[PDB]
């Protein structure tokens, strides 16, 4: 039961308090998060250990226990929901129409929502509840607000 | 360092939700270390 489906906080502790460094998705026995959350290191889940399996620093993604399982794609048209899991706050659904990161290799959906750094890895959902990507790799625009790519791996 | 995970909820679409944020159209580049930058 250390890999039951759901969204999870990623925490670190030393000798004192804990810090939320990110968020991830457990699906089909595999944990999915952003590379900058864990730096690709192993995770504890209760009494168990989750070992890194696949990852890519350029995509800023890592999976644990098996290959990347999340395959749903933004349809380029519809509103989406960020299931934001900020440090010290309950999970909340935020609906938005993505903008676009236009790159030399193609377009990527992008959400203009601002949260603390430890919200990295929060899942972005389509209307069927499928995870179409993870929040937290993006840019800061002129006024200081944030735009996150909808970062999705290849299944 | 103890890096560990804690369950935080079910993954479910919320019917009738607050729709918010704008939809910016940005030109960006992605480098080999995973950093996005404005172009």
């Amino acid at each position: 039961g250390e890999t039951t489906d759901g969204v999870y906080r990623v925490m670190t502790r030393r000798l004192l308090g804990s810090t939320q460094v990110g968020v991830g998705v457990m699906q089909e026995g595999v944990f999915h998060t952003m590379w900058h959350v864990t730096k690709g290191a192993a995770l504890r889940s209760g009494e168990g250990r989750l070992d890194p399996y696949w990852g890519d620093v350029k995509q800023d993604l890592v999976s644990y226990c098996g290959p990347w399982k999340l395959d749903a794609a933004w349809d380029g048209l519809s509103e989406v929901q960020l299931l934001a899991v900020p440090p010290g706050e309950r999970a909340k659904n935020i609906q938005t129409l993505p903008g676009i990161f236009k790159t030399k290799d193609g377009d990527i959906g992008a959400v203009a929502l601002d949260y603390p750094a430890g919200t990295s890895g929060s899942p972005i959902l389509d209307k069927c509840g499928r995870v179409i990507g993870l929040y937290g790799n993006g840019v800061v625009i002129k006024n200081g607000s944030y735009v996150s790519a909808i970062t999705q791996g290849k299944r | 360092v103890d890096m560990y995970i804690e369950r935080a909820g079910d993954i479910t679409w919320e019917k009738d939700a607050e729709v918010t944020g704008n939809s910016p159209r940005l030109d960006v580049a992605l480098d080999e270390s995973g950093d996005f930058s404005l172009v």
Partner: peptide, 4 residues
């Protein structure tokens, strides 16, 4: 971002 409270870019990451």
């Amino acid at each position: 971002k409270x870019k990451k």
